[PDB]
């Protein structure tokens, strides 16, 4: 059994958002679903829970007028609606089953700022040869990074993004043997959901 | 609200040694129905939490038998008989006896390995970035141990602190090492006015810096 959450969202302040959490046909219709908030580099905060059959809920007093927990029995889906969104609502939100599973999380960015497409640059070097990929100037978070569509994953270090100043930037390194590159092809594959961009950049000597 | 105090704040342990994490509640977790609602979660780097233990001592499915949970009332304990690299992360206790439900602050578990030196790599601005009028110089300091490291950027014999954007990874389970990335952002022009670009790494493993350089005009 596993819980699949809805994709990331960027919403303007004052507006409202609705997230989904879906499990297999069994567990959800009998188990309690909790909702938890986690701000980057911080601990966990319980928002509330919802009961299966009876549609009964319980809220943390801090979220009384912020969150609203609902469930669709027919589709095995629990929802969380957050209202009058503030920068303080920018965080990762998880759903957690009383019977064990947790969702992957849904990232929420509360910002006035505009959706920017990322600039993708191939980092060519000047036993093993290290290659790179720079992902500069994009908004909001997150982005997805793979090497050669996925056939390269072993010797890879993907780094977290940093904020400066509108606008986020992150990098990734791939260390393969001196014989592997440039005899065989190594390409970088970046994807930003918000800007609807899918970039593929070949690392060239 | 029930305050959940976790001790120690951090734990650094050698592979195969025992680990003990404490969780103390401000109120008894013994409920009106005779049950005790205390859960233990592990947050792995770049992952959502996962529950290891429920109702003081029950192990979740797939949780290795080296994990043991115990306690009663206001004092709880999570134990690892002989630690493994895949056990690293932040440990959180979760109470459900009182409302609102609350979590402990966390306990960071870092794995102890033999001190490794960073593999330094330097990258000049790509041709593409230079076309678009931008200039970023990237430097990777990969697979080192311990975590404390200093990245100094030198341009033509002088230190540069402006335009520097540093980013660290959390300890990898696969080799118990830390990695880091540094970026020096300049305008194409500032970049074109300088020639020698250095990435110095100051660590414990060597005396003294691990220097990587390139000449723009080369
Ligand atoms: O799911 C919860 O509410 C919960 C939160 C923290 C700690 C334990 C629980 C928990 C329960 C809490 C209160 C209650 O009345 C019943 C609970 O039942 C559980 C059953 C589990 O299998 C596993 C866990 C629980």
């Amino acid at each position: 059994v596993q819980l699949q959450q809805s994709g990331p969202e960027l919403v303007k302040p004052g507006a409202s958002v609705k997230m989904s959490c879906k499990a297999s046909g069994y567990t959800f219709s009998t188990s309690v679903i909790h909702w938890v908030k986690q701000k980057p580099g911080q601990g966990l905060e319980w928002i509330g829970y919802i009961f299966p059959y009876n549609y009964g809920t319980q809220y943390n007093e801090e979220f009384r007028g912020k969150a609203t927990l609902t469930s669709d029995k027919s589709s095995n889906t629990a929802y969380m609606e957050l209202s009058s969104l503030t920068s303080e609502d920018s965080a990762v939100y998880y759903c957690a089953s009383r019977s064990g599973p947790w969702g992957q999380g849904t990232t929420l960015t509360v910002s006035s700022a505009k959706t920017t497409a990322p600039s993708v640059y191939p980092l060519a070097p000047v036993s093993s040869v290290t290659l790179g990929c720079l992902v500069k100037g994009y908004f909001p978070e997150p982005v997805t990074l793979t090497w050669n569509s996925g056939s390269l994953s072993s010797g890879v270090h993907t780094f977290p993004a940093v904020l400066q100043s509108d606008l986020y930037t992150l990098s990734s390194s791939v260390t393969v043997t001196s014989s592997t590159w440039p005899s065989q092809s190594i390409t970088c594959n970046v994807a930003h959901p918000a800007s609807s961009t899918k970039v593929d950049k070949k690392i060239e000597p | 609200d029930v305050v959940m105090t976790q001790t120690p704040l951090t734990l650094s342990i050698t592979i195969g040694q025992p680990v003990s994490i404490s969780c103390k509640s401000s109120q008894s977790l013994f409920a009106s129905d005779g049950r005790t609602y205390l859960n233990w979660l592990l947050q792995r780097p770049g992952q959502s939490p996962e529950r290891l233990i429920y109702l003081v001592s029950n192990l979740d499915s797939g949780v290795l038998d080296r994990f043991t949970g115990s306690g009663s009332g206001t004092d709880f304990t999570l134990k690892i008989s002989r630690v493994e690299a895949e056990d690293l992360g932040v440990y959180y206790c979760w109470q459900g006896t009182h409302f609102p439900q609350t979590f402990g602050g966390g306990t960071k578990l870092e794995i102890k390995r033999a001190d490794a030196a960073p593999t330094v790599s330097i990258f000049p601005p790509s041709s593409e970035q230079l076309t678009s009028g931008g200039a970023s110089v990237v430097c990777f300091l990969n697979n080192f141990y311990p975590k404390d490291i200093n990245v100094k950027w030198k341009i033509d014999g002088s230190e540069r602190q402006n335009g520097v954007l540093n980013s660290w990874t959390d300890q990898d389970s696969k080799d118990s090492t830390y990695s880091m990335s540094s970026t020096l952002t300049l305008t194409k022009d500032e970049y074109e006015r300088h020639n020698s670009y250095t990435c110095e790494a100051t660590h414990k493993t060597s005396t003294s810096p691990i220097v990587k350089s390139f000449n723009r005009n080369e």
Side-chain angles (χ1 to χ4, degrees), chain A residues 34 38 46 49 94 98-100 102-103 121-123 126 130 136 154 157 159-160 162 164 171-173 201, chain B residues 41 43 48-49 51 92 99 101 121 123-124 126 128-129 132 140 142-143 165-168 174 179-181:
Chain A
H34 299 267
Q38 182 179 44
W46 182 82
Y49 66 54
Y94 314 102
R98 167 174 284 180
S99 76
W102 275 63
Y121 313 121
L123 302 172
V126 244
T130 303
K136 215 193 119 71
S154 202
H157 298 257
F159 299 89
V162 284
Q164 177 221 252
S171 49
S172 190
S173 47
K201 220 65 80 176
Chain B
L41 302 158
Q43 181 161 46
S48 55
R51 192 183 71 189
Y92 291 115
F99 287 92
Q101 295 190 355
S121 283
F123 294 86
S126 58
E128 320 210 327
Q129 185 174 201
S132 80
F140 303 124
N142 290 350
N143 301 282
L165 291 183
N166 287 319
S167 177
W168 302 258
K174 210 173 165 192
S179 282
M180 105 118 94
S181 154

Side-chain angles (χ1 to χ4, degrees), chain B residues 32-135:
Chain B
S32 61
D33 62 6
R35 304 200 159 280
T36 306
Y37 306 116
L38 190 272
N39 287 349
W40 284 100
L41 302 158
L42 164 69
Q43 181 161 46
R44 281 156 108 178
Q47 309 236 76
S48 55
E50 58 176 0
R51 192 183 71 189
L52 295 182
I53 302 171
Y54 62 104
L55 306 158
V56 182
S57 49
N58 300 83
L59 300 196
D60 276 280
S61 189
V63 177
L64 274 135
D65 287 278
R66 68 178 172 275
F67 285 96
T68 248
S70 68
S72 59
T74 55
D75 280 80
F76 300 89
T77 295
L78 163 88
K79 283 184 156 81
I80 325 169
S81 58
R82 38 172 199 87
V83 85
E84 290 195 2
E86 62 137 286
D87 301 349
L88 80 209
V90 184
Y91 286 86
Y92 291 115
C93 49
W94 174 16
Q95 75 82 12
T97 290
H98 304 283
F99 287 92
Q101 295 190 355
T102 61
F103 298 93
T107 294
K108 199 132 113 177
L109 173 65
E110 44 241 331
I111 299 304
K112 271 185 190 177
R113 75 150 281 155
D115 301 354
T119 293
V120 185
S121 283
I122 197 163
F123 294 86
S126 58
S127 37
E128 320 210 327
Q129 185 174 201
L130 291 164
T131 309
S132 80

